[PDB]
Design a protein around this motif. Structure first.
Motif, PDB file in Angstrom:
ATOM      1  N   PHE A  99       0.825  -1.209   0.000  1.00  0.00           N
ATOM      2  CA  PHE A  99       0.000   0.000   0.000  1.00  0.00           C
ATOM      3  C   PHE A  99       0.861   1.261   0.000  1.00  0.00           C
ATOM      4  CE2 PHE A  99      -2.000   3.177   2.836  1.00  0.00           C
ATOM      5  CZ  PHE A  99      -3.111   3.492   2.099  1.00  0.00           C
ATOM      6  N   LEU A 100       1.826   1.347   0.903  1.00  0.00           N
ATOM      7  CA  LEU A 100       2.694   2.514   0.953  1.00  0.00           C
ATOM      8  C   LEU A 100       3.446   2.697  -0.357  1.00  0.00           C
ATOM      9  CD1 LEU A 100       4.235   2.174   4.526  1.00  0.00           C
ATOM     10  CD2 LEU A 100       2.438   3.738   3.789  1.00  0.00           C
ATOM     11  N   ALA A 101       3.849   1.599  -0.988  1.00  0.00           N
ATOM     12  CA  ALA A 101       4.570   1.702  -2.253  1.00  0.00           C
ATOM     13  C   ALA A 101       3.712   2.335  -3.332  1.00  0.00           C
ATOM     14  CB  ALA A 101       5.013   0.320  -2.684  1.00  0.00           C
ATOM     15  N   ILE A 102       2.438   1.956  -3.412  1.00  0.00           N
ATOM     16  CA  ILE A 102       1.560   2.586  -4.404  1.00  0.00           C
ATOM     17  C   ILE A 102       1.376   4.061  -4.096  1.00  0.00           C
ATOM     18  CG2 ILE A 102      -0.739   2.629  -5.447  1.00  0.00           C
ATOM     19  CD1 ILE A 102      -0.935  -0.376  -4.932  1.00  0.00           C
ATOM     20  N   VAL A 103       1.081   4.405  -2.848  1.00  0.00           N
ATOM     21  CA  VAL A 103       0.853   5.810  -2.521  1.00  0.00           C
ATOM     22  C   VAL A 103       2.117   6.621  -2.759  1.00  0.00           C
ATOM     23  CG1 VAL A 103       0.087   7.443  -0.749  1.00  0.00           C
ATOM     24  CG2 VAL A 103      -1.004   5.197  -0.952  1.00  0.00           C
ATOM     25  N   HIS A 104       3.279   6.071  -2.399  1.00  0.00           N
ATOM     26  CA  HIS A 104       4.498   6.797  -2.703  1.00  0.00           C
ATOM     27  C   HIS A 104       4.617   7.028  -4.209  1.00  0.00           C
ATOM     28  CE1 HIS A 104       8.275   8.584  -1.474  1.00  0.00           C
ATOM     29  NE2 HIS A 104       8.773   8.102  -2.600  1.00  0.00           N
ATOM     30  N   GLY A 105       4.305   6.001  -5.002  1.00  0.00           N
ATOM     31  CA  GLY A 105       4.295   6.161  -6.451  1.00  0.00           C
ATOM     32  C   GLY A 105       3.380   7.273  -6.914  1.00  0.00           C
ATOM     33  N   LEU A 106       2.173   7.339  -6.361  1.00  0.00           N
ATOM     34  CA  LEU A 106       1.262   8.423  -6.713  1.00  0.00           C
ATOM     35  C   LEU A 106       1.896   9.775  -6.439  1.00  0.00           C
ATOM     36  CD1 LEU A 106      -2.053   6.995  -5.326  1.00  0.00           C
ATOM     37  CD2 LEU A 106      -1.461   7.327  -7.730  1.00  0.00           C
ATOM     38  N   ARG A 107       2.526   9.924  -5.277  1.00  0.00           N
ATOM     39  CA  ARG A 107       3.106  11.207  -4.903  1.00  0.00           C
ATOM     40  C   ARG A 107       4.309  11.532  -5.774  1.00  0.00           C
ATOM     41  NH1 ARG A 107       3.089  11.515   1.639  1.00  0.00           N
ATOM     42  NH2 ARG A 107       3.649  13.684   1.085  1.00  0.00           N
ATOM     43  N   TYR A 108       5.112  10.512  -6.075  1.00  0.00           N
ATOM     44  CA  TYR A 108       6.282  10.657  -6.932  1.00  0.00           C
ATOM     45  C   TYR A 108       5.898  11.131  -8.327  1.00  0.00           C
ATOM     46  CZ  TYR A 108      10.416   9.215  -9.535  1.00  0.00           C
ATOM     47  OH  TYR A 108      11.517   9.190 -10.373  1.00  0.00           O
ATOM     48  N   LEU A 109       4.874  10.506  -8.914  1.00  0.00           N
ATOM     49  CA  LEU A 109       4.473  10.869 -10.269  1.00  0.00           C
ATOM     50  C   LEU A 109       3.790  12.229 -10.299  1.00  0.00           C
ATOM     51  CD1 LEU A 109       3.219   7.395 -11.492  1.00  0.00           C
ATOM     52  CD2 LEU A 109       5.305   8.552 -12.188  1.00  0.00           C
ATOM     53  N   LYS A 110       2.980  12.539  -9.296  1.00  0.00           N
ATOM     54  CA  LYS A 110       2.322  13.832  -9.234  1.00  0.00           C
ATOM     55  C   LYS A 110       3.335  14.955  -9.150  1.00  0.00           C
ATOM     56  CE  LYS A 110      -1.186  16.372  -6.660  1.00  0.00           C
ATOM     57  NZ  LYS A 110      -2.277  16.480  -7.686  1.00  0.00           N
ATOM     58  N   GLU A 111       4.342  14.801  -8.300  1.00  0.00           N
ATOM     59  CA  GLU A 111       5.356  15.833  -8.140  1.00  0.00           C
ATOM     60  C   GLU A 111       6.095  16.098  -9.442  1.00  0.00           C
ATOM     61  OE1 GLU A 111       6.168  17.545  -5.284  1.00  0.00           O
ATOM     62  OE2 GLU A 111       7.792  18.630  -6.293  1.00  0.00           O
ATOM     63  N   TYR A 125       1.884  -0.006 -11.810  1.00  0.00           N
ATOM     64  CA  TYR A 125       1.606  -1.434 -11.668  1.00  0.00           C
ATOM     65  C   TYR A 125       1.937  -1.889 -10.252  1.00  0.00           C
ATOM     66  CZ  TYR A 125       0.861  -2.700 -16.598  1.00  0.00           C
ATOM     67  OH  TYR A 125       0.365  -2.828 -17.895  1.00  0.00           O
ATOM     68  N   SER A 126       1.035  -2.688  -9.678  1.00  0.00           N
ATOM     69  CA  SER A 126       1.262  -3.421  -8.434  1.00  0.00           C
ATOM     70  C   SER A 126       0.740  -4.832  -8.653  1.00  0.00           C
ATOM     71  CB  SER A 126       0.460  -2.797  -7.299  1.00  0.00           C
ATOM     72  OG  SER A 126       0.483  -3.615  -6.147  1.00  0.00           O
ATOM     73  N   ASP A 127       1.368  -5.828  -8.021  1.00  0.00           N
ATOM     74  CA  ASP A 127       0.827  -7.178  -8.085  1.00  0.00           C
ATOM     75  C   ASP A 127      -0.143  -7.486  -6.941  1.00  0.00           C
ATOM     76  OD1 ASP A 127       2.350  -7.963  -5.851  1.00  0.00           O
ATOM     77  OD2 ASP A 127       3.919  -8.897  -7.046  1.00  0.00           O
ATOM     78  N   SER A 128      -0.466  -6.496  -6.106  1.00  0.00           N
ATOM     79  CA  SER A 128      -1.225  -6.716  -4.866  1.00  0.00           C
ATOM     80  C   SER A 128      -2.695  -6.336  -5.036  1.00  0.00           C
ATOM     81  CB  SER A 128      -0.590  -5.912  -3.740  1.00  0.00           C
ATOM     82  OG  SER A 128      -1.379  -5.991  -2.550  1.00  0.00           O
ATOM     83  N   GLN A 129      -3.542  -7.344  -5.207  1.00  0.00           N
ATOM     84  CA  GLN A 129      -4.986  -7.151  -5.202  1.00  0.00           C
ATOM     85  C   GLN A 129      -5.396  -6.330  -3.991  1.00  0.00           C
ATOM     86  OE1 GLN A 129      -8.347 -10.460  -4.422  1.00  0.00           O
ATOM     87  NE2 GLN A 129      -7.267 -10.855  -6.344  1.00  0.00           N
ATOM     88  N   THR A 130      -4.852  -6.684  -2.832  1.00  0.00           N
ATOM     89  CA  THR A 130      -5.233  -6.017  -1.592  1.00  0.00           C
ATOM     90  C   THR A 130      -4.885  -4.538  -1.628  1.00  0.00           C
ATOM     91  OG1 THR A 130      -4.971  -8.044  -0.345  1.00  0.00           O
ATOM     92  CG2 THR A 130      -4.826  -5.983   0.891  1.00  0.00           C
ATOM     93  N   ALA A 131      -3.627  -4.212  -1.938  1.00  0.00           N
ATOM     94  CA  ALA A 131      -3.182  -2.822  -1.858  1.00  0.00           C
ATOM     95  C   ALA A 131      -3.891  -1.958  -2.891  1.00  0.00           C
ATOM     96  CB  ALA A 131      -1.667  -2.730  -2.018  1.00  0.00           C
ATOM     97  N   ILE A 132      -4.144  -2.505  -4.082  1.00  0.00           N
ATOM     98  CA  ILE A 132      -4.874  -1.753  -5.097  1.00  0.00           C
ATOM     99  C   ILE A 132      -6.240  -1.345  -4.566  1.00  0.00           C
ATOM    100  CG2 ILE A 132      -5.850  -1.867  -7.403  1.00  0.00           C
ATOM    101  CD1 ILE A 132      -3.482  -3.702  -8.182  1.00  0.00           C
ATOM    102  N   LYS A 133      -6.942  -2.282  -3.919  1.00  0.00           N
ATOM    103  CA  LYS A 133      -8.247  -1.981  -3.344  1.00  0.00           C
ATOM    104  C   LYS A 133      -8.137  -0.962  -2.213  1.00  0.00           C
ATOM    105  CE  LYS A 133     -12.389  -3.989  -1.331  1.00  0.00           C
ATOM    106  NZ  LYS A 133     -12.546  -2.979  -0.247  1.00  0.00           N
ATOM    107  N   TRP A 134      -7.144  -1.111  -1.332  1.00  0.00           N
ATOM    108  CA  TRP A 134      -6.992  -0.162  -0.240  1.00  0.00           C
ATOM    109  C   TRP A 134      -6.773   1.249  -0.759  1.00  0.00           C
ATOM    110  CZ3 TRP A 134      -3.194  -2.824   3.740  1.00  0.00           C
ATOM    111  CH2 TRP A 134      -3.860  -3.887   4.344  1.00  0.00           C
ATOM    112  N   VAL A 135      -5.969   1.400  -1.808  1.00  0.00           N
ATOM    113  CA  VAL A 135      -5.758   2.730  -2.370  1.00  0.00           C
ATOM    114  C   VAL A 135      -7.051   3.274  -2.968  1.00  0.00           C
ATOM    115  CG1 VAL A 135      -4.538   4.069  -4.120  1.00  0.00           C
ATOM    116  CG2 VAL A 135      -3.281   2.447  -2.694  1.00  0.00           C
ATOM    117  N   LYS A 136      -7.785   2.437  -3.711  1.00  0.00           N
ATOM    118  CA  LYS A 136      -9.076   2.843  -4.263  1.00  0.00           C
ATOM    119  C   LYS A 136     -10.027   3.337  -3.175  1.00  0.00           C
ATOM    120  CE  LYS A 136     -12.860   0.899  -7.058  1.00  0.00           C
ATOM    121  NZ  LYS A 136     -13.280  -0.287  -7.855  1.00  0.00           N
TER     122      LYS A 136
END
Ligand SMILES: [K+]
Ligand SMILES: [Mg+2]
Ligand SMILES: [Mg+2]
Length: 135
Positions: free
Chosen positions: A50-62, A70-81
């Motif tokens: 989860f933290l890796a995806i959110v960090h990615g969001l912040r990295y790309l936005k900046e 891309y993430s392989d984690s069904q769980t983390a993708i849902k948590w971010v959504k």
RNA sequence: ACAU
DNA sequence: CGATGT
């Protein structure tokens, strides 16, 4: 169907689960490592995914980048959504750091916008995600 | 079961 | 084999 090569891929690595957690993000095309988080003494695999995806969001936005993540984690993708990480990890003194980061990541999602597509890496068809730790 |  | 998650 087709890999979107113009993308950022993220993954977690751990020593134990729960255990020591790190994560990183790579350019899917080249494997260049774009960010890496210092190991966190106790967390779960899913908190790190989860933290890796959110960090990615912040990295790309900046960087004003519209690339997908891309993430392989069904769980983390849902948590971010959901903007909510539904971890079972006990909240105590030794888990305070990971929970601080998770709380802060939720807070960021709740105060910022983004259009970044968050895509499931299809490990069964494509092999390991390019950000994988090989362990 | 599926995803880690 | 154990754990984290939907
Ligand atoms: K690995
Ligand atoms: Mg993973
Ligand atoms: Mg991996």
């Amino acid at each position: 169907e087709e890999i979107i090569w113009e993308s950022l891929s993220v993954d977690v690595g751990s020593q134990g689960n729960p255990g020591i957690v790190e994560y990183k993000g790579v350019d899917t095309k080249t494997g260049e490592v774009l960010f890496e988080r210092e190991p966190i003494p106790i967390g779960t695999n899913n908190m790190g995914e989860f933290l890796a995806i959110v960090h990615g969001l912040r990295y790309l936005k900046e960087r004003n980048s519209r690339k997908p993540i891309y993430s392989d984690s069904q769980t983390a993708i849902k948590w971010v959504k959901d903007k909510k990480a539904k971890s079972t990890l006990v909240r105590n003194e030794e888990t305070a750091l990971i929970w601080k980061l998770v709380d802060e990541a939720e807070e960021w999602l709740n105060t910022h916008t983004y259009e970044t597509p968050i895509l499931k890496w299809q490990t069964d068809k494509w092999g390991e995600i390019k950000a994988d730790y090989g362990r």
